[PDB]
Design a protein around this ligand. Structure first.
Ligand SMILES: CN(C)Cc1cn(Cc2ccc(C(=O)NO)cc2)c2ccccc12
Ligand SMILES: [K+]
Ligand SMILES: [K+]
Ligand SMILES: [Zn+2]
Length: 638
């Protein structure tokens, strides 16, 4: 039932700064907070968010993650002059103190708890806290790397204590390793920590052996710590997405967290003087979007780093846009991750194979920098149009509508006379397809839609052909059914995904046909193919429209909502779904996911059939030379 997105911010946290010269700490300025909040106001994003006030974290709350000794020492810094503050700062690595930093540290922490309470009390769907000082380097008895208290560690400990969550996922996409977080949950299997980070074979700060891929956690927590070290600078959108499709998401959906907290440091973005990576701000729209179907959307984004004020503003907007549900921007130029990234990726996957299903088949062997300003993102006036069979009034979610103009009806006749003849109620189906498609493609007024149809072949043809004419340069087709369709994948403008019951050997590289064995194992197998095959091809293909098609036959579709939601990362969310036959369940589920609603978790799934994982790896072997984003190992050289 929850709706809205929280934005927790307060200008008080910009009221401490570095007071002596120190080239390591110069980069961390109050303007990081000012610039990010002002960027959100300029784009009308703050105004769309529920402003939740900051509060101070209590002493009891700080002691969840820090020791009395260290809190006591920090509590004396407001009484210190600058000489004493310099001496106290020098006891720690890469941190400076200020008469107001204890105050703001308590606010940055309390802000995070406010966000956790709003989300877990269902007052909002998700949210973001813009805070200073950052947290993820902070440790039980020490400040480190601009961090005083560990805001994100707080949030998970607090969520554990006050809501009795058994499973919390923390995603740390800052460019630095959140070693404070890793230390805090090393032995705790109830918190899964994922972190990518510039490493460079341990030559990059904080220079820690245990920032490497081999630190998987300790004791009962083995396998719930996941480090992906970047060993070269300049990592791109393709590296980040390869990290998500082939490491993070396969683990996250199996973990099935009850809450997601994000250490959202944007020094991993292009232009940052410290990360020196190359991912565009747009990538964060997708990082956010790909995590949103977890935990019924309960996602708390907490700011960490980000030092290029321009890069910083644009990545914060891209994140809030996606929290608010705005359509995701198209990512072009995707391909293989670079070789160093594939090394890191395959090493993490191999070492994690002891602990996670999706990787288990790897163990047995029988199996001034400037860039283009991001485009405006804007919620469609009506997000989803729906065309149920004639005479079915239905309870539509808040942003939906039902169904034909003279222009349109003229066109259906032209198509009728040239290519078909037919005289039926299909003539209504095809008029609906066209008028829905025209609202999707022509206007930013409507985003996606679902039409119930009866005749499959004619419906598919008119939908596909009318789309290529608008023109939609490329169309991704996702078809759950058997047989072949009036779809030609020979010119490179169409890619066909087919989920079917009979195993049919496909030849060329513009078709991905998945035939999974029947039974209780089918749900886990579908999610593996979705995350590790379908999504990487689709993102590289970068279609302008997605056309979904479901045969009346298949029943076993507890997964359709997850794909509908993930697949809206492509084509700015422009997806038309054709449902063959009526099924109030499937139609209400499709419309709900299309409309941006919360998706219900999958929970525990029976791990997939070896015959299923083998068939999928046969598809990856067959397609990954054309679609490099499918690769999760370094390629063999001649
Ligand atoms: C490289 N630069 C010219 C100066 C410099 C800053 N630091 C500390 C630091 C801590 C944390 C974060 C962060 O954003 N974490 O998420 C960013 C920076 C250093 C440490 C060792 C050597 C040099 C430097
Ligand atoms: K990180
Ligand atoms: K853990
Ligand atoms: Zn950082």
């Amino acid at each position: 039932a929850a709706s809205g997105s929280a934005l927790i911010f307060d200008e008080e946290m910009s009221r401490y700064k570095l007071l002596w010269t120190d080239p390591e700490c110069e980069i961390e300025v109050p303007e990081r907070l000012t610039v990010s909040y002002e960027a959100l106001r300029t784009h009308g994003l703050a105004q769309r968010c529920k402003a939740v006030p900051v509060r101070q974290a209590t002493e009891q709350e700080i002691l969840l993650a820090h020791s009395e000794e260290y809190l006591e020492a920090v509590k004396q810094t407001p009484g210190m002059n600058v000489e004493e503050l310099m001496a106290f700062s020098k006891k720690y690595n890469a941190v400076y103190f200020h008469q107001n930093i204890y105050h703001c540290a308590k606010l940055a922490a309390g802000a995070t708890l406010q966000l956790v309470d709003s989300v877990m009390k269902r007052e909002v769907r998700n949210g973001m806290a813009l805070v200073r000082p950052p947290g993820h380097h902070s440790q039980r008895s020490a400040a480190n790397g601009f961090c005083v208290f560990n805001n994100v560690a707080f949030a998970a400990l607090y969520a554990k204590k006050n809501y009795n969550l058994n499973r919390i996922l923390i995603v740390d996409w800052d460019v630095h390793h959140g070693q404070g977080i890793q230390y805090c949950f090393e032995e705790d299997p109830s918190v899964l920590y994922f972190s990518w980070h510039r490493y460079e074979h341990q030559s990059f700060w904080p220079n820690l052996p245990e920032s490497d891929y081999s630190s998987v956690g300790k004791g009962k927590g083995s396998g719930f710590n996941i480090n992906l070290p970047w060993n070269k600078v300049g990592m791109t959108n393709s590296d980040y997405l390869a990290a998500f499709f082939h490491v993070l998401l396969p683990v996250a959906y199996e973990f099935d967290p009850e809450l997601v907290i994000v250490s959202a440091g944007f020094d991993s973005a292009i232009g940052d003087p410290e990360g020196e990576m190359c991912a565009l701000p747009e990538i964060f729209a997708h990082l956010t979007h790909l995590l949103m179907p977890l935990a019924a959307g309960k996602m708390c984004v907490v700011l960490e780093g980000g030092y290029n004020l321009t890069s910083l503003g644009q990545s914060v907007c891209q994140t809030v846009h996606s929290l608010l549900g705005d359509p995701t921007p198209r990512i072009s130029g995707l391909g293989t991750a670079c070789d160093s990234a594939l090394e890191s990726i395959q090493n993490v996957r191999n070492v994690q194979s002891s602990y996670w299903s999706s990787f288990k088949h790897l163990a047995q062997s029988e199996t001034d920098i400037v860039w283009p300003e991001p485009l405006k993102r804007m919620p469609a006036s009506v997000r989803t149009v729906v065309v149920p069979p004639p005479g079915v009034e239905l309870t539509l979610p808040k942003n939906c509508q039902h169904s034909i103009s003279e222009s349109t009806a003229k066109e259906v006749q032209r198509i009728r006379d040239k290519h078909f003849l037919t005289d039926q109620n299909i003539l209504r189906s095809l008029g609906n397809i066209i008028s829905v498609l025209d609202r999707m493609m022509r206007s930013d007024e409507v985003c996606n839609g679902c039409v119930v149809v009866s005749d499959l072949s004619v419906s598919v043809q008119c939908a596909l052909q009318h789309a290529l004419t608008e023109p939609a340069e490329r169309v991704l087709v996702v078809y759950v059914g058997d047989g072949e369709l009036p779809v030609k994948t020979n010119d490179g403008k169409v890619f066909l995904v087919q989920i079917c019951t009979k195993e049919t050997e496909d030849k060329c590289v513009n078709r991905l046909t998945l035939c999974l064995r029947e039974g209780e194992s089918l749900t886990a197998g579908f999610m593996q193919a979705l995350l590790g095959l379908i999504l990487p091809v689709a993102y590289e293909f970068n279609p302008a429209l997605v056309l979904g098609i479901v045969e009346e036959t298949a029943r076993l579709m507890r997964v359709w909502g997850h794909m509908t939601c993930l697949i809206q990362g492509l084509a700015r969310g422009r997806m038309l779904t054709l449902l063959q036959g009526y099924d109030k369940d499937l139609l209400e589920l499709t419309v709900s996911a299309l409309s941006g609603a919360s998706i219900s978790p999958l929970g525990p799934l029976r791990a997939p059939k070896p015959e299923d994982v083998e068939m999928m790896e046969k598809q990856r072997q067959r397609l990954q030379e054309r679609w490099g984003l499918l690769r999760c190992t370094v390629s063999e050289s001649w």
